[PDB]
Each structure stands twice: as C-alpha cells, then as structure tokens.
Design a protein around this ligand. Structure first.
Ligand SMILES: Cn1c(=S)n(CCSc2nc3ccccc3[nH]2)c2ccccc21
Length: 114
C-alpha cells in the first residue's frame, strides 16, 4: 500500500502507452486457457500476469515500490516467451511491447518519493 513518484510514472506514463499500443490487446486481460485452446498453459506458466491485473494493482496502491511493479511486467513478458513457440506472432508482439517498457523505465524519474 503506497503511492510514489515512480509508481505514478509507471501507471500514468509507461502503462498508459503500452495499454493502447496496437499489439497490446492480447495482454489487457488474463490469458484464457479455455477460450484460446491451450489446456496446458497453466501447467507450464505458474504465475500468470497481464496488464489488467497490473493496472488494477497500481489503481489500488497494491505496490510498495516500483520495482515490484516492474517485476510483474517482466513476468507477463517472460511467460509469453517461455510458453509460446519461437515463431508465434505473440512473441514478436511481446518483444515490441517490452522494448517500449524498458525504454520508458530508463527515463523513470529517480526520486522514489512518497
Ligand atoms: C496464440 N494467440 C492468442 S491465444 N492470442 C489472443 C489471446 S491473448 C493472449 N495473450 C497471450 C500471452 C502468451 C501466450 C498466448 C496469449 N494469448 C493471440 C493474438 C495474436 C497472435 C497470436 C495469439
């Protein structure tokens, strides 16, 4: 429970841009193993993560520090590289989204205030 200048930057700057990105749609909500037909998804991915959950957590002061939030973004991206075949379009979409993420994090203000 906490609001800091970094967490605010992750919510209003970084996540805002990632969210409406043209390749964001598969990431805005939890992966639906049933709907998408991957009955083995949850046997391989033990810690599912998606942008909806991350956004909600930033809106409820769930995070104590920005690093905990960055870790969730990383898990979401990593889940995708681990589970899918190397050639899937989804892998390309996650790498594209992750580069934005890393680029924005590099400019995250360092004052870790509040
Ligand atoms: C296979 N595949 C699926 S399903 N979707 C849409 C459902 S959202 C989603 N997030 C994932 C994160 C990791 C793995 C599968 C994931 N599926 C795709 C969209 C575009 C291209 C390929 C796709």
């Amino acid at each position: 429970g906490r609001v800091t200048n970094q967490l605010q930057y992750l919510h209003k700057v970084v996540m805002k841009a990632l969210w409406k990105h043209q390749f964001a749609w598969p990431f805005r909500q939890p992966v639906d193993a049933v709907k998408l037909g991957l009955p083995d998804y949850h046997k391989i991915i033990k810690q599912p993560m998606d942008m909806g959950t991350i956004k909600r957590r930033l809106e409820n002061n769930y995070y104590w520090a920005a690093s905990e939030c960055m870790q969730d973004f990383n898990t979401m991206f990593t889940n995708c590289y681990i589970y899918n075949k190397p050639t899937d379009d989804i892998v390309l979409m996650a790498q594209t989204l992750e580069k934005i993420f890393l680029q924005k994090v590099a400019s995250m203000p360092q004052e870790e205030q509040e």
